[PDB]
Amino acid sequence: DELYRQSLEIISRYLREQATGAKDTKPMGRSGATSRKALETLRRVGDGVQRNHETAFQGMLRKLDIKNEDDVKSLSRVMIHVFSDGVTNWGRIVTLISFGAFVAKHLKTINQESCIEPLAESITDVLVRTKRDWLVKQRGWDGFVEFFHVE
């Protein structure tokens, strides 16, 4: 499943980098150029999204009461509820990932960094399993990058 692996490398790097403040300088895998431009796209757009929904993000974070990895594994159901039904567009997907980053920052603050990568997996798993065909028709991460690109 190459779509899942690409999505997880992008999402995982964006989440851990938002939580630690440090960029990950390890080379990317195949489709490296696209994934690097996708992660740059998320650094430009994602922080605007998080500031924009700060009130709603904080409310939802508190209502989910995340404390350990078992809590992290119990988040897919609400995630799926909020994300699955209705219209899909790239902004919705950025919002998914962006709240992911918001939560990853929280996990780092309560010294639960080890939960960031299960978080990332859960996010990727919900994305690819619920939006795969859409992702394929928007040409995947190249479609994402082209969508948010301005010259």
19 binds ligand 6AK (CB under 6 A): no
Build a one-symbol-per-residue string for 25-54: x at contacts with ligand 6AK by CB under 6 A, - elsewhere. Answer: ----------------------------x-
> How far apart are alpha carbons 65 and 94 in whole angstroms?
23
Which of these, 111, 80, 85, lies nearest to 96 by C-alpha position? 80
> How far apart are alpha carbons 66 and 116 in whole angstroms?
12
Question: Toward ligand 6AK, which CB reaches closer, 11 or 145?
Answer: 11
141 binds ligand 6AK (CB under 6 A): no
The contacts of residue 107 (CB under 8 Å, 6+ apart) are 19, 66, 72, 113, 115, 116, 119
Question: Toward ligand 6AK, which CB reaches closer, 89 or 114?
Answer: 89
Count of residues interacting with ligand 6AK (CB under 6 A): 20
* CA dihedral sign of residues 61, 67, 72, 75: negative
> How far apart are alpha carbons 101 and 120 in whole angstroms?
9
Question: Toward ligand 6AK, which CB reaches closer, 28 or 60?
Answer: 60
Tally of CB atoms within 10 A around 62: 10
| Closest distance to ligand 6AK from the beta carbon of 147 (Å) | 13
Within positions 67 to 106, which residues make up the interface with ligand 6AK, using CB under 6 A?
75, 78-79, 82-83, 86-87, 89, 91-92, 95-96, 99-100, 103
Contact residues for ligand 6AK, defined by CB under 6 A: 53, 56-57, 60, 75, 78-79, 82-83, 86-87, 89, 91-92, 95-96, 99-100, 103, 123
